[PDB]
Scaffold this active site. Structure first.
Site, PDB file in Angstrom:
ATOM      1  N   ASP A  95       0.777  -1.250   0.000  1.00  0.00           N
ATOM      2  CA  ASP A  95       0.000   0.000   0.000  1.00  0.00           C
ATOM      3  C   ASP A  95       0.809   1.301   0.000  1.00  0.00           C
ATOM      4  O   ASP A  95       0.297   2.300  -0.516  1.00  0.00           O
ATOM      5  CB  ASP A  95      -0.959   0.031   1.203  1.00  0.00           C
ATOM      6  CG  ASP A  95      -2.162   0.969   1.003  1.00  0.00           C
ATOM      7  OD1 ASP A  95      -2.470   1.335  -0.153  1.00  0.00           O
ATOM      8  OD2 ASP A  95      -2.832   1.320   2.017  1.00  0.00           O
ATOM      9  N   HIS A 102       2.053   3.537   7.410  1.00  0.00           N
ATOM     10  CA  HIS A 102       2.029   4.383   6.208  1.00  0.00           C
ATOM     11  C   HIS A 102       0.858   5.377   6.169  1.00  0.00           C
ATOM     12  O   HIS A 102       0.770   6.148   5.202  1.00  0.00           O
ATOM     13  CB  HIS A 102       2.051   3.529   4.918  1.00  0.00           C
ATOM     14  CG  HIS A 102       0.996   2.457   4.852  1.00  0.00           C
ATOM     15  ND1 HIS A 102       1.176   1.206   5.412  1.00  0.00           N
ATOM     16  CD2 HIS A 102      -0.232   2.437   4.275  1.00  0.00           C
ATOM     17  CE1 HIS A 102       0.102   0.469   5.192  1.00  0.00           C
ATOM     18  NE2 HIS A 102      -0.778   1.196   4.526  1.00  0.00           N
TER      19      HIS A 102
HETATM   20 ZN   LIG Z   1      -2.698   0.693   3.956  1.00  0.00          ZN
END
Ligand SMILES: [Zn+2]
Ligand SMILES: *[C@@H]1O[C@H](CO)[C@@H](O[C@@H]2O[C@H](CO)[C@@H](O[C@@H]3O[C@H](CO[C@H]4O[C@H](CO[C@H]5O[C@H](CO)[C@@H](O)[C@H](O)[C@@H]5O[C@H]5O[C@H](CO)[C@@H](O)[C@H](O)[C@@H]5O)[C@@H](O)[C@H](O[C@H]5O[C@H](CO)[C@@H](O)[C@H](O)[C@@H]5O[C@H]5O[C@H](CO)[C@@H](O)[C@H](O)[C@@H]5O)[C@@H]4O)[C@@H](O)[C@H](O[C@H]4O[C@H](CO)[C@@H](O)[C@H](O)[C@@H]4O[C@H]4O[C@H](CO)[C@@H](O)[C@H](O)[C@@H]4O[C@H]4O[C@H](CO)[C@@H](O)[C@H](O)[C@@H]4O)[C@@H]3O)[C@H](O)[C@H]2NC(C)=O)[C@H](O)[C@H]1NC(C)=O
Ligand SMILES: *[C@@H]1O[C@H](CO)[C@@H](O[C@@H]2O[C@H](CO)[C@@H](O)[C@H](O)[C@H]2NC(C)=O)[C@H](O)[C@H]1NC(C)=O
Ligand SMILES: OC[C@H]1O[C@H](O)[C@@H](O)[C@@H](O)[C@@H]1O
Ligand SMILES: [Zn+2]
Lengths: 937, 935
Positions: free
Chosen positions: A145, A386
């Protein structure tokens, strides 16, 4: 019926590796614990406890099923709630290879706004738990991601961890189109110019997303088509579903090399009811393989990688990094390089403090608390996620992150205070022994503002967590103008008093209440400054009782009218550039007719009209310890430019906010430093605080760039700094936090320092970046204060200033305060000291980035060479550290070199071979090396 | 953490019995198989495979957990897919009491529009499977969703099954308010006037719905509050959730007797991920009990009932039934008593056919196929579901129900043909299904075997099988194209025949509907009907050979104007009433200023306007076998009133449709029979075809009715018929399918025969009741019969019971074309499976006779009469099983419970304190006795 779920790969067919997974964000739309327990589902339907509960049940049913899990922050919370019987089952599932850990860090960290030390720290926290509980070593990196990818991610948090591969979904959308046409989505990535093919990794960019092909998401209550293979029921559809599967596989096969492709069978917080997925995959594997046109199997990213490696195949090369990331023509994800500047500084500040805390705890014999509830290890590990330090989580989640960090910081403060009490006494000491201050930035330090009783002094203990000698200006707020500062031998020191200013005084009133709950006493009247001199890894003690600037070699000139920087020059080294520094802001786009993309927490999309540009000097100050120029640019942008004694650089303190947005225009604020340097479109930015990468304006190495955003497409994430050069000069800028930087015109460098938007950017967080501080109720835009540091050098001499100051910015002095009579204090405490050999320093090329007590008497140690091979003629060379002299007061009994995350013996690490297109206890370190050791005393 | 999930009940505290369940409709918004496999989730999120999968996994995790499951149509589909290891785990879970079957029928049947024979059949199908796999006998009835409740449900499909209790959510909304105030939600229910306290059951009406209290639905992905008891995580909330729990429990305790209440912890198709629920219930039991103010436990409806029974408590009495049901002021759920008339008739036809199929299969020695895929047992059992024959499912689901019934009917037709070919052969099973042809579209004049020409030297052979244990004479009426046919009996004598001419209404039906049903246009509409009187022994056959204004041929006469009916009289018995019959329709409400509620598939809400009105005789016909009046009321409503020879009643055939709705007015069509009889607001309607209950207009026994719907609140569900009486006359109406009926004025009876609405009624099916046939679409047309007669007081019951059984079980015709002398040479033209000259008593019906697995034969005999009804027939009687099976020799006989899962002698009953308190088979009134036999 019995399903043939044990299929493996077959040589002469296309093989579809089905990889079941659940992308579990450690906080984003919900907090970490809400995601875990499954609360607040009206925000987002997500419960990690269900994922682990039901996956374990589904894996138990059939030994051929597999599942990969990554985020140990969630796994550890779940583990501690499980019965001894479930733990035994999990050990069996993991040992048999049914449950495989990929990545294995505490979280899946951002790669843009994270520092390599924090990346290593949380990865070690997860890896040590996995090794201790399961005797397992993760071999696949999982970065599915994060929004772009760093060079350090490939070689340091990839190859050097022992990973054979790393997998990710997000790359630039123009790059992706070329990589599909070239079949170069999968590469051998050499992220280090220094180590090249010796620290390389198989890098797999997914064709599009980290989910399944269309029609192959099987989450409970979704409207998917079940495979109906019971002839006693209406509407069997075996043929149709097998052909659905084949069709999707053949499409992927056309953009992939070899006869192996990977399906990422999962998505965000999926597998709440794992059996819903495993039922369909059981049936698909069985019936697809009966049909036999292609071959399907349960797999993992490491089994997939082994298959790719075994193919007779040569692979394209990847160098450098995958920044910046854009998923559309007006959607460059470079805003989050700056987003939530205050959280980013909080993380960086606590990371340095945590490094010093672990030093002091070790020296004082304190025992590890890494896995205790709410420990700073947990809170800082979570903060690397993140969506956390990147600033792309919801506000309430962001608040939760800071609450966790504050809790861990409070525990670290007690460890530091108690350890310093034992260590300076000539461990049991209470935390009350010393007081400490973390709000100097708003002038709040009760221990130094308080009146000193008669026959007593303010005792200032200064601890230096660097392995280097250090002199540094101590700067504390006081209320007495006639204080004397004595060093430990009784010498009176040269001091300088600096007057309080109104900007700081208004910050102090507002923010002390916001943080502590009530208003403090009067804005103290002065700062007292003196120069401290401290041994490496040690302490000193000081007793306190009743248009042109530059006190040293570096000089700056300012207009007496528009009090802006006009020139920097060094008398001794003879460097001299005309340079201007100003503040501007871009207006945030809100989209238009042709593209509705707005600027937001992730994406920086400026209006395209020139950034809006009446400053004045409100103070010039000169003294033996600092020369200062206070600059007011407008009512919400102010700066102090400071040239301190014996500092080879200027310290530029910004104060930005509240950013006004009642006019309905988002604003993203930059400082821009403009010179006539012939920089030729080139500029240099760091990778997670380590390697510098040469950036070229409006240029991409791997594809012919179509320019769509001439500003946003040239922003790069900084965690150390940004620099430029020409034939005569090197201009360097260091940051105190993760920060976006760019060079938009030759000789020009800018940093984005603070952002406030009115619109969301449509990537899922559902919130404008609209940070406010509140109280009855008085809310305003957030204000950030920090420093950036600028200097000038001759070519090939700026490197050692960037590395040395970068480490000093990371690891400042720690101050500890008490009030005692000087004589009595000296008679019970050592006032100066060192844990190393007296008169020993680490070489100037080396930093002690890890020193930490683990369980038993195991001590973890890491030493890093800070320079790349061609940076510094003297320091970019092989050097050595004498561990015996590092540990003077103890005797090393055993030394064991281990992998970077300390889950492998270093000598037993093996590497895959790839065919790539185009092809005494003394520790030696060459450039950019990091060596990790476990010690016994 | 270890959670203390093993709590039982405690004596000095309120006990909360947590009963996990999943209400799994056997078809409704999706088909049965879509619900099972989890397809079409965009219609409704529902997957029963996940329920059974994940429940078994969750129960395996903790031996104290419990779950109850009902519908064997789903369980059996799931079972056949499971591995040996899973089947053994289920056996362990059931043996341990963790998984308990409640109800245990193939489905949870409707109680309004179902016949007791079909209720018994599907319930036996599920109970035999449960008994065979797990050696378990269900003790708690589960009717949580059906829309009102019948007397027969309480005493016959409750007490007589061996159930100690029955549990349901739906009762009338006014009745519920009174029962909350009196704490009379739970009662001892005596649904039989005949059996009283000897067939009683503990009946538990839930406070509101069969879901959990607010905030205690724990389905995966729902927005509930998880109990957060880990102090290493932020936001623990143990005390709050414990108090949430206690608060809900105290509220329910205020309207419940004893220190035991029950939480129905589930809802429609819940438990897709069972562990989501069991995690929360584990934690609640643990922490609520640590708290100590109340006591929580995993329980079942039978464990709960046992605690209610052990309590020192007297209970209020419930008599009769819970019909009609309304959930609000203008929302009487009485529309579905008629909704989907054609499906209701299809079910009733196939039920009677399946009774005869199992008879003939037993006689011919055919092997049982009850659990084979798509068997008629499965299709008819599914059809009893409370959205199936009730008419309250989506149209696509409804078509699927009919698809399944047709598959089963084709299989049964082959069994009947093959069986009859073996059984009528002289040297008596190998015969092929092609031996005989059969016709089930006589209603639209389509029967190729009789319409086709007869070759020379051959005759049309007509085998007539009678599945009643009574001798029967009846008129055979077949469509033919030849005007000079002769009909001979088996002795060779020519029989009296009557030719009836085809009519235009039936011919118009024929061309459209044959193509719709069979896929091809038929040949020309046949020119005539050939009628002759057949005479058949009980449980036997006869063979016939075919080759080359006041009406009434008998005592019953009817007067018509030159075209409305005006009088019925019987010269021989001395009854004579002026009586008018007409067609009307209520206009469907679409909501008004006071209430948005619309009339729909469930709810009958008429407009408030009086029903609009419709007329001319189109034909008068007289003959020795039938007198007929053909009547056209409008372009979409026609009728034939038929007085057949030797029939003590008139047979009125209705043809209704297409109901026109392009004017924007939904319409609900009735036939109304208006007399001057002094009926004094009383009328009688049957319970699932059995007991008659006395209904009183605008009156309720159990509460003081606030009249809000003077028509819809007086509709009741019919499966046998409706009748009225005064001092001089008894007027009786019998139906051919589940039908709604009422008496809205004294001396007046009406039937609702067909309904088409423009709006949905907001109870979840999401569709107007808008049935169409297409190839070109038009509203559905229904054809059927209702039967009327007049009698002196106390002799109409005999006709009701006798004719009722004859309607249920008509003759079966089987055709072939062969030379008469050749046929007689290789076949017996007459036969009987009982002893020659033996007949069942006139009060008894053979409602079950079927081969089970191994040599096992299931037999059921029903006494049809209530004590008050017939001086001669409402008496003790006996059946000699040795004569019932003349052709065979009884080797073993065991009497069993009604669903044949228990030995009769071993059944035990709970005791309650109630406020206000040879092989010869004897039968008393209303008794049903069930036996297992080996030959
Ligand atoms: Zn994520
Ligand atoms: C009189 O009397 C009577 C008595 O007798 C009554 O009643 C009636 O009856 C009758 C008899 O007689 C019946 O009929 C039947 O029916 C059934 C049913 O039907 C229905 O349904 C169907 C189905 O449905 C489903 O599907 C579809 C498609 O897809 C859809 O659309 C729907 O919706 C549904 O769906 C659902 O489900 C599914 C599953 O199941 C799923 O998938 C989905 O998704 C969903 O969910 C249908 O189709 C139908 O329709 C039709 O019809 C109607 C009417 O009714 C109309 O309206 C329509 O339109 C249609 O029609 C059309 O189309 C057709 C087709 O194409 C054509 O043909 C025409 O023409 C037109 O155009 C309904 O709705 C059924 O099933 C049946 O059928 C059968 O049979 C026959 C003969 O019989 C034939 O023809 C056919 O074809 C069939 O056959 C089959 O089966 C059989 C058994 O049964 C066998 O034997 C054979 O062989 C076959 O099979 C085989 O083959 C096949 C082929 O394909 C296959 O499939 C398999 O595999 C095997 O192998 C019959 O038709 C009726 O129903 C009744 N009625 C009621 C109402 O109920 C009466 O009423 C009286 N009348 C008066 C009174 O008036
Ligand atoms: C149920 O509770 C009643 C109420 O106390 C009990 O009845 C009392 O018990 C004894 C007789 O056994 C006497 O002390 C009282 O006079 C009784 N009172 C009444 C009103 O009857 C009764 O014993 C309990 N058990 C049963 C089976 O009835
Ligand atoms: O005859 C059985 C057959 O019926 C029809 C179809 O809907 C099939 O799914 C089924 O197998
Ligand atoms: Zn239901």
């Amino acid at each position: 019926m019995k399903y043939n779920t044990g299929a493996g790969t077959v040589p002469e067919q296309l093989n579809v590796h089905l990889v079941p997974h659940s992308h579990d964000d450690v906080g984003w739309l919900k907090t970490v614990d809400q995601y875990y327990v499954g609360s607040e589902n009206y925000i987002q339907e997500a419960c990690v406890e269900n994922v682990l509960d039901s996956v374990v049940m589904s894996l138990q049913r059939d030994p051929n099923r597999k599942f990969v899990f990554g985020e140990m922050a969630f796994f550890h919370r779940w583990w501690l709630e499980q019965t001894p019987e479930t733990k035994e089952l999990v050990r069996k599932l993991v040992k048999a290879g049914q449950l495989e850990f990929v990545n294995g860090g505490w979280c899946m960290h951002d790669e843009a706004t994270t520092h390599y030390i924090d990346m290593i720290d949380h990865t070690t926290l997860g890896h040590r738990f996995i090794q201790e509980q399961f005797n397992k070593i993760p071999r696949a990196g999982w970065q599915i991601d994060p929004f772009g990818h760093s060079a350090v991610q490939g070689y340091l948090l990839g190859a050097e961890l022992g990973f054979d591969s790393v997998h990710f979904a997000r790359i630039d959308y123009q790059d992706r189109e070329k990589r599909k046409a070239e079949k170069s989505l999968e590469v051998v990535w050499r992220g280090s110019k220094t180590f090249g093919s010796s620290a390389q990794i198989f890098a797999n960019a997914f064709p599009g997303h980290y989910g399944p092909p269309n029609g192959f998401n099987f989450e409970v209550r979704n409207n998917f088509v079940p495979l109906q293979d019971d002839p006693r029921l209406f509407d069997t559809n075996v043929e149709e579903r097998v052909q659905n599967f084949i069709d999707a596989a053949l499409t992927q096969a056309k953009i992939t090399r070899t006869n192996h492709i990977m399906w990422t069978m999962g998505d965000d917080f999926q597998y709440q009811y794992a059996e819903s997925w495993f039922k369909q995959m059981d049936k698909l594997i069985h019936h697809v393989n009966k049909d036999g046109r292609v071959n399907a199997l349960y797999s993992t990213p490491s089994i997939y990688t082994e298959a790719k490696n075994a193919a007779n195949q040569t692979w394209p090369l990847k160098i450098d990094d995958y920044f910046p990331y854009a998923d559309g023509r007006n959607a460059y994800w470079t805003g989050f390089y700056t987003s939530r500047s205050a959280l980013k500084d909080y993380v960086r500040m606590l990371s340095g403090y945590y490094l010093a805390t672990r030093q002091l705890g070790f020296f004082a014999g304190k025992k590890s608390t890494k896995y205790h509830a709410f420990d700073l290890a947990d809170a800082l590990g979570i903060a690397q996620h993140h969506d956390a330090v990147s600033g792309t989580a919801k506000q309430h989640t962001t608040n939760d992150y800071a609450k966790r960090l504050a809790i861990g910081a409070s525990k670290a403060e007690a460890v530091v205070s108690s350890s310093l009490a034992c260590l300076t006494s000539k461990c049991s000491a209470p935390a009350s022994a010393f007081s400490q201050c973390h709000l100097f930035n708003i002038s709040y330090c009760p221990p130094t503002e308080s009146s000193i009783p008669d026959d007593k002094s303010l005792v200032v203990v200064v601890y230096n967590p660097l392995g280097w000698s250090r002199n540094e200006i101590v700067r504390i707020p006081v209320n007495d103008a006639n204080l004397v500062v004595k060093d430990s031998s009784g010498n009176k020191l040269e001091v300088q008093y600096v007057e309080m200013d109104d900007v700081t005084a208004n910050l102090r009133s507002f923010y002390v209440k916001a943080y502590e709950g009530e208003v403090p006493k009067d804005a103290d009247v002065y700062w007292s400054l003196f120069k401290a001199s401290v041994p490496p890894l040690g302490w000193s003690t000081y007793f306190i009782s009743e248009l042109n600037i530059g006190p040293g070699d570096l000089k700056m000139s300012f207009s007496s009218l528009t009090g802006q920087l006009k020139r920097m020059y060094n008398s001794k080294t003879g460097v001299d550039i005309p340079i201007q520094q100003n503040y501007l802001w871009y207006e945030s786009s809100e989209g238009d007719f042709s593209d509705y993309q707005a600027s937001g927490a992730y994406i920086f999309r400026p209006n395209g009209q020139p950034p809006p540009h009446r400053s004045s000097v409100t103070r010039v100050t000169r003294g033996p310890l600092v020369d200062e120029v206070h600059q007011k640019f407008n009512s919400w942008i102010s700066q102090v430019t400071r040239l301190y004694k014996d500092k080879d650089h200027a310290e530029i303190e910004f104060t930005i906010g509240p950013i006004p947005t009642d006019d309905g225009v988002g604003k993203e604020v930059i400082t821009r430093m403009t010179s006539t340097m012939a920089t030729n479109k080139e500029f240099y930015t760091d990778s997670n605080g380590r390697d510098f990468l040469k950036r070229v304006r409006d240029y991409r190495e791997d594809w012919p760039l179509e320019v769509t955003q001439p500003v946003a497409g040239n922003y790069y994430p900084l965690n150390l700094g940004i620099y430029t050069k020409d034939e005569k000069s090197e201009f360097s800028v260091l940051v105190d936090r993760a920060t976006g930087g760019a060079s938009i015109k030759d000789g020009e460098v800018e940093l984005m320092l603070h952002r406030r938007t009115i619109r969301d950017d449509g990537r899922g967080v559902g919130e404008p970046l609209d940070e406010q501080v509140c109280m009855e109720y008085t809310c305003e835009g957030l204000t950030v204060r920090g420093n950036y540091y600028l200097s000038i050098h001759k070519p090939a001499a700026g490197s050692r200033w960037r590395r040395t100051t970068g480490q000093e910015i990371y690891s400042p002095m720690l101050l500890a305060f008490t009030q005692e009579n000087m004589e009595n204090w000296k008679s019970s405490h050592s006032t100066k000291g060192i844990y190393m050999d007296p008169n020993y320093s680490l070489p100037p090329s080396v930093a002690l980035i890890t020193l930490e007590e683990l369980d038993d008497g195991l001590v973890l140690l890491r030493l890093a060479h800070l320079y790349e091979p061609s940076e510094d003629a003297e320091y970019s060379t092989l050097t050595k550290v004498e561990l015996k002299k590092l540990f003077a007061t103890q005797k090393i009994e055993e030394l064991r070199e281990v992998s970077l995350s300390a889950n492998q013996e270093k000598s037993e690490m093996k590497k895959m071979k790839w065919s790539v297109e185009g092809d005494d206890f003394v520790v030696e370190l060459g450039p950019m090396e990091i060596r990790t050791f476990l010690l016994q005393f």
